[PDB]
Design a protein around this ligand. Structure first.
Ligand SMILES: Nc1ncnc2c1ncn2[C@@H]1O[C@H](COP(=O)(O)OP(=O)(O)OP(=O)(O)O)[C@@H](O)[C@H]1O
Ligand SMILES: Nc1ncnc2c1ncn2[C@@H]1O[C@H](COP(=O)(O)OP(=O)(O)OP(=O)(O)O)[C@@H](O)[C@H]1O
Ligand SMILES: Nc1ncnc2c1ncn2[C@@H]1O[C@H](COP(=O)(O)OP(=O)(O)OP(=O)(O)O)[C@@H](O)[C@H]1O
Ligand SMILES: Nc1ncnc2c1ncn2[C@@H]1O[C@H](COP(=O)(O)OP(=O)(O)OP(=O)(O)O)[C@@H](O)[C@H]1O
Ligand SMILES: Nc1ncnc2c1ncn2[C@@H]1O[C@H](COP(=O)(O)OP(=O)(O)OP(=O)(O)O)[C@@H](O)[C@H]1O
Ligand SMILES: [Zn+2]
Ligand SMILES: [Zn+2]
Lengths: 492, 468, 493, 210
């Protein structure tokens, strides 16, 4: 009753990559002879939870028959007399007594993280025990160490070295029909019907790293046994998976919306000129990045926007997350602002570090007047001031690689609180004021809502749009919101 | 590998301690929260409540199985039950490949904390008859010098101690030794050559050398007082010279265990001493040695001191590297932390106690060896009971020249009488093996008539009648 | 199984410092009693990690004849009931019984922190045992104690006394000839091809360390066996395997202290035909002619404050000055600020000030002046002692630093009046160089400078674009030229 | 003491979906064998404390006849981080011996807090023991775990991911008819007169917890 190599799919590229560093030091070690070099030991896996890090560790152990070992994160961390430093070297000599062997250290960020916070506890001397333990592994082709974590930036950078932990690999998200392989594993034991199809499930499940897919087929079985009031032939149906989509949340309990708000290109009313200029954003240079290396110049870094509120600074700001389906993030203005004074510069650091790590990505900003603050702090006198929040992002956004899909886009309502160095070229180049729509573009503003509702064709579409003589794009949503409560009126 | 039949029975039983409902329980009747949960058999809090001072090693094996085997994957079956080593690994897995040039901390023996062992192998030594060891003290009453012996016995379960093994002894064999008033010291070569043939007859009789006894009496005035009181709280419990003889006897007889990596661990050996009580009698006591520290350092570093409570620690000569030994004791003002930067460290700390006793005379399971306990023993040359075939006319004689089988078989089950007959090897070894099995086992009446109808027993009584 | 003696290249200067220190008095009890000088009984090695701390100690002690008592850092203090002192007392006692001996304490920073970061009670018990037992070796027992560490500032300051640890040996990063020497002793047992050139690999890898050079040869061999695998005949490592290893891997700068020498040559900022003579007297002339200051007696100005218009001013006006030195550039920036609320505010700058004179030459760039000492140095200041510990070490490290070694600092900001006036104190900022706005004679050469790697048609006139730029700086010149490259690729689309 | 199903109301829409969560896998474990998947193990409850969170678990325990194991929140976590991991090991071992069994725990926020800026607590070695104990044991064993807490957002998000605590119920304050039902329950023994009201007495409360 153990798992194998065929037990998990979707990560077939990462499966064949990780199988080289475990089989070749153990099965055929003669390739490292007469070539001079030494076979490496550490393999580093990292990703979001629910991706199958411990599942991949147990699958490679039982398929080779090696001496598998397990070292847990919060388990071996003692405060008695330094017993964690004696139990780490106890696990290394026990793995050295049996050949071949493999150890596994999950949640390695929990054991001795980076010293930006603690810096004085016993964890400083815990990690240095692990430095001399892995470097003293002169026994060739015996022990192979693998690790798993969730945040590669919280760990100390001394582990990412030649000897102990090199050759890191990121277990990504199975988006390219990888959820079909997960559905082939889990639903092969359940009894199925003719109406179900696994190809019509992966196209609608954005994200879905794999743990919620196993929860989706179990919850679909709960809907099938719900109608049985209580010889038995239940099966499944297509409506059970559609019931499990709406009545169960995806991996969004930590943050509410990070992916999209389910919009498209034609959901903003009018503004066909900014739809053309949005094709010079990250849609353009991803599929051809060698043209800028041929032409020898960096592409555009940032486009800025400012104008009247309610003209498309949330619809078009989230339409970039749907036209390429990149690794979107959602962050508010004063939500970046923290209560601590020392966190005032590191909170923009981890956001920008996730942008270069989740390439290609889409970031945005709202209400930069709380962030720019062109005077540079109001009065002073305090233990902390409002001056490091703007002077850090103006330099960190310059210290980014051009070929890493990093950019910014703006959405403000006050053109005077923003600093002149905020609107600097090279950081925010195109000073584009968003305009109020004219009479030629305010017809498709109402049509952005009439695409989904069945409007009667006898009603004139331009008769309600002709009442606008200088209105905004959100004001015609107020009419269909007023008509949302004025249409029924008799069906209570 | 196969262990003993007694050791495998203690492993299968869990030995849990049941508890009842209480006022502190807030749960329902069909459950248990913490106060009526089943108690583990290795908790030392329940042990000292019933005045049990050790945790019954088979339960200590269970408390390390919970640390070895977990709910997680593991896939190891390590079972870390091994002898902790104080010797120095020569290869050392580092750049200091010779010990003459180089030693680091991963191969250096750590400083001995001198923590007492919480588990004993044998939990309670028991005896068979008070007339058996009465002959052993009677040897001192005739020659006035100290004696020595070896105890042959078996093992079975013990229901008083939770998951405990009790030690049963059946007979006592005495090796030839040179007695002395102060102490005793014999040659180990003639004893080992003599003990090799006794182990041959002990296999068919179902016996095993698992113990030894030595006497220490110092009679006061031979009138109203029985003996002096040498061993008390202020004096030594065991002399350091007898720790050496107890340590070599445990290493010669290992105990087989499947959980150990080397194949043998936790030797079941008893050392009993006749010393006398505090007030007025000759009551005996027994302690066995500790496995954790004393059992391995006796191969290289134990040296004799002039004090009976302590033993000297000698120096290192190019291979015999020893660590520092520390213990806590009170100074002239208060109680202080470890002081020992000085030799002659005490050896009474490295002994774990036992509970000796004699069973009730009204009932028992069996006794298996009570024939006379008055036959002259094999190697009692200091006493007058070392006779030739003149004794066989006096002892058994096939009683009154025509013996009843209820009165003849009761004398033939003696241990030293059967060990004296086969040394002459008149009978065949096949007929001798059924002779000793008839005397030690039940339903002997059908097989005793087979012995008297054989021509070998007829030649034994015919060659005895013509001789004196 | 141990390493030899001549298996270390690049560190030849520190090798000759340590061969006369710990090897020569160990094998020779004479020539010190006759000279009347007792030999030193303690050395300290420190520097960046991955430079040869644990490798050089095992190499210098093997092929000389010694005892070589090894002792690790985190392996001690992990004992129970207080026996780490007895493991230390038996360590020094057993070494002198069979003299000559070498006691190499590896990772001593994990044993002795400072007294303000003390933890429990067993940490005080092992630092006072080490300080007592270090003084007991004054009987000339021929015992040399070698101590290796990584951070010399986090160690306890009571270890450098007269007799405990007198000499300190700093191990710096290798040069282009130094990194080439380690590549020879790392490709000895490796089967190499003929297309490889080790001189070009050492010239490209500037910010590499002694541990990153082992990653360059081991990854190219692992890349080659991923290609050659089908149904061991010829495994010569090619040039493309080393070129791929330069791409997918990276040097030791994982957002640590930055080790790079990214500098541009001349005529890369437009114009400067009257400003280039003002910058040649601050980073070249203290290096080319140091005797002009020692003969007169003046202190050379190692600091120049820079401030100017938007566009340029931060890096390309400062990194184009030091073209002749091209040393390691350790810079402070935006994210290098008060991230930890205790201690790591100026202690991250204390290893920049003290190491600038120890690891000379090293150029330190200073920017973002409005985010370090804006409200703290003013008339209102800081009330409460929360974060007023920033304006003190920036001023008290000025008078304590002299012009003994090659030090250089550059301050640049967008607002010169937003910094504390004590940063502009006399004696340290006596040379004030102002970078002005580029005029019409300089803006045309800016458009010829940032259009360097482009297929530019020379038939057009770049002056006509720059003639319409009066209030438009070099950023707007970058803004007007980025849109010309957007529609140029669109013509190919 | 001996409580039943008819002692509490208000959450009857949630009480019906609880009876298919903890009684249906215990009374009929072979139904999940026919559908292939494993039965669920962990269902947790939350809301304001004092709506009968501890009385709800004792009601479904006595109405099924199974074993009822109980581990208190602020009791087993107040030890010195060494006996808590063995108490949880004794909890799952005893429930496996006398299957069918339920395991009710309360105040899991005191056992499982969140990681925040105010580090300095123990926060480990106990919940990680619960992680490695709960992901196993699914070899068609008749055991379920029931958690209870006060604040449902102070719990660690690793518990509410999959397979450990996946189903949740929100027993909150009752409505006007919910307090009317518990008013008839708590007044079944008091000999009242005919002057008392029930609908007006429930409507005049409007915020009263059970
Ligand atoms: N091939 C697969 N890829 C991704 N997920 C899978 C796959 N097969 C199964 N799964 C589901 O994903 C889950 C695996 O998650 P896992 O137990 O590894 O958590 P984890 O957080 O990765 O582990 P750790 O605590 O070590 O980080 C399983 O519960 C399983 O239902
Ligand atoms: N193309 C469009 N033009 C104008 N309005 C639109 C368009 N499409 C939808 N709307 C409506 O206008 C609203 C957009 O307002 P939005 O959320 O941008 O507020 P905002 O004040 O502009 O944002 P911010 O708070 O960033 O200023 C939506 O609620 C939507 O119904
Ligand atoms: N001359 C050299 N300088 C630096 N590193 C070298 C040199 N020659 C070889 N190396 C490589 O560097 C490694 C030795 O580094 P070392 O063990 O000293 O790490 P360190 O950071 O210097 O000290 P520590 O071990 O205390 O971290 C060897 O594995 C070797 O492959
Ligand atoms: N000779 C030059 N004159 C003007 N601009 C130039 C020149 N050479 C390059 N540039 C362009 O101008 C930009 C220089 O701007 P810089 O980085 O100095 O911003 P800054 O605001 O001046 O710096 P700081 O943040 O220190 O004020 C570069 O991005 C570069 O493309
Ligand atoms: N249906 C009901 N709704 C609300 N209260 C009830 C109901 N039935 C009985 N009660 C009363 O409410 C009390 C239930 O409170 P309970 O024992 O759950 O305390 P609790 O604080 O919720 O438990 P915990 O300590 O787990 O938080 C009982 O004493 C009972 O008299
Ligand atoms: Zn109870
Ligand atoms: Zn060693």
């Amino acid at each position: 009753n153990e798992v194998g190599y065929d037990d998990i799919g979707g990560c077939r590229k990462q499966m064949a990559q990780i199988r080289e560093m475990v089989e070749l030091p153990l099965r055929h070690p003669q390739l490292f002879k007469a070539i001079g070099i030494k076979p490496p030991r550490g393999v580093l896996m990292y990703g979001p939870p629910g991706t199958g890090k411990t599942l991949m560790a147990r699958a490679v152990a039982n398929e080779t028959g090696a001496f598998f070992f397990l070292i847990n994160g919060p388990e071996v961390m003692s405060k008695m007399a330094g017993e964690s430093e004696s139990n780490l070297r106890k696990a290394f000599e026990e793995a050295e007594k049996n050949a071949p062997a493999i150890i596994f250290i999950d949640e390695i960020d929990s054991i001795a993280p980076k010293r930006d916070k603690t810096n004085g506890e016993v964890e400083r001397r815990v990690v240095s025990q692990l430095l001399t333990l892995m470097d003293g592994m002169k026994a060739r082709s015996n022990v192979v160490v693998i690790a798993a974590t969730n945040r590669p930036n919280s760990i100390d950078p001394a582990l990412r070295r030649f000897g102990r932990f090199d050759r890191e690999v990121d277990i990504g998200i199975p988006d390219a029909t990888g959820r079909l392989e997960v559905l082939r594993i889990h639903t092969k034991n359940m009894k199925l019907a003719d109406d179900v199809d696994l190809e019509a499930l992966a196209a609608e499940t954005h994200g879905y790293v794999g743990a919620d897919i196993a929860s989706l087929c179990s919850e679909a079985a709960m809907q099938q046994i719900r109608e049985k009031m209580d010889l038995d032939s239940l099966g499944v149906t297509m409506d059970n998976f559609r019931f499990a989509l709406g009545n169960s949340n995806p991996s969004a309990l930590r943050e509410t919306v990070v992916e999209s708000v389910n919009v498209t290109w034609d959901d903003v009313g009018g503004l066909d000129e900014i739809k053309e200029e949005l094709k010079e954003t990250v849609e353009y240079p991803v599929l051809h990045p060698d043209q800028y290396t041929k032409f020898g110049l960096s592409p555009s870094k940032g486009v800025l926007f400012y104008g009247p509120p309610g003209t498309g600074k949330t619809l078009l700001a989230k339409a970039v997350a749907t036209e390429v389906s990149a690794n979107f993030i959602s962050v508010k203005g004063p939500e970046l602002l923290s209560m601590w004074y020392g966190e005032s510069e590191s909170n923009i650091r981890d956001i920008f570090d996730k942008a270069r790590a989740a390439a290609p990505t889409v970031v945005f900003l709202d209400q930069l007047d709380s962030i720019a603050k062109a005077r540079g702090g109001s009065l002073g006198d305090a233990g902390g001031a409002s001056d490091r929040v703007v002077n850090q992002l103006l330099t960190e956004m310059d210290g980014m690689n051009a070929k890493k899909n990093v950019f910014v886009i703006g959405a403000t309502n006050r053109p005077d609180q923003i600093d002149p160095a905020i609107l600097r070229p090279g950081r925010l180049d195109q000073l584009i004021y968003v305009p109020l729509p004219d009479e030629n573009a305010r017809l498709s503003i109402l049509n952005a809502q009439l695409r989904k509702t069945p409007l009667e064709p006898g009603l004139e579409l331009t008769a309600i749009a002709k009442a606008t003589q200088g209105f905004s794009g959100a004001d015609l949503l107020y009419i269909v919101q007023r008509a949302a409560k004025y249409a029924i009126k008799d069906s209570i | 590998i196969k262990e003993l039949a007694v050791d495998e029975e203690l492993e299968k039983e869990d030995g849990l301690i049941p508890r009842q409902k209480s006022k502190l329980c807030k749960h329902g009747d069909r459950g248990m929260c913490e106060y009526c949960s089943p108690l583990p058999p290795w908790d030392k809090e329940y042990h000292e409540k019933n005045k049990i001072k050790h945790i019954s090693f088979h339960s200590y094996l269970k408390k390390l199985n919970e640390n070895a085997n977990k709910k997680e994957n593991g896939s190891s079956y390590i079972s870390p039950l091994s002898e902790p080593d104080f010797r120095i690994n020569k290869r050392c897995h580092n750049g200091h490949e010779p010990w003459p040039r180089g030693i680091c901390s991963k191969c250096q023996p750590s400083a001995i904390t001198l923590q007492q062992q919480e588990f004993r192998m044998v939990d309670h030594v028991e005896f068979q008859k008070s007339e058996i060891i009465n002959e052993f003290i009677q040897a001192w009453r005739y020659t006035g010098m100290q004696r020595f012996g070896y105890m042959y016995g078996s093992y079975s379960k013990y229901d008083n101690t939770p998951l405990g093994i009790k030690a049963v002894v059946e007979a006592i064999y005495e090796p030839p030794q040179h007695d002395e008033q102060d102490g005793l010291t014999m040659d180990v070569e003639q004893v080992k050559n003599e003990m090799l043939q006794i182990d041959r007859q002990a296999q068919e009789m179902g016996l095993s050398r698992i113990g030894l006894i030595f006497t220490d009496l110092s009679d006061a005035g031979a009138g109203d007082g029985s003996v002096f009181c040498k061993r008390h709280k202020d004096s030594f419990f065991l002399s350091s010279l007898e720790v050496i003889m107890a340590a070599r006897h445990q290493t010669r007889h290992p105990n087989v265990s499947k959980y150990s990596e080397q194949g043998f661990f936790s030797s079941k050996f008893v050392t009993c001493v006749i010393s006398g009580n505090l007030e007025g009698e000759i009551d005996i006591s027994s302690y066995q040695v500790s496995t954790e520290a004393e059992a391995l350092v006796t191969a290289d570093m134990i040296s004799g001191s002039t004090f009976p409570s302590m033993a000297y620690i000698n120096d290192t000569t190019d291979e015999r590297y020893v660590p520092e030994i520390f213990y806590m004791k009170s100074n002239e003002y208060g109680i202080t932390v470890k002081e020992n930067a000085k030799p002659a460290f005490p050896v009474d700390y490295l002994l774990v106690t036992l509970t000796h006793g004699f069973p009730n005379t009204d009932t028992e399971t069996n006794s298996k060896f009570v024939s006379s306990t008055g036959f002259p023993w094999s190697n009692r040359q200091a006493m007058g009971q070392s006779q030739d075939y003149q004794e066989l006319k006096k002892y058994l004689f096939n009683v009154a020249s025509s013996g009843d089988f209820n009165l003849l078989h009761e004398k033939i089950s003696n241990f030293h009488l059967l060990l004296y007959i086969n040394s002459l090897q008149i009978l065949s070894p096949d007929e001798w093996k059924l002779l000793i099995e008839s005397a030690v086992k039940n339903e002997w009446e059908e097989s005793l008539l087979k012995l008297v109808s054989s021509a070998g027993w007829q030649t034994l009584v015919m060659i005895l009648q013509e001789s004196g």
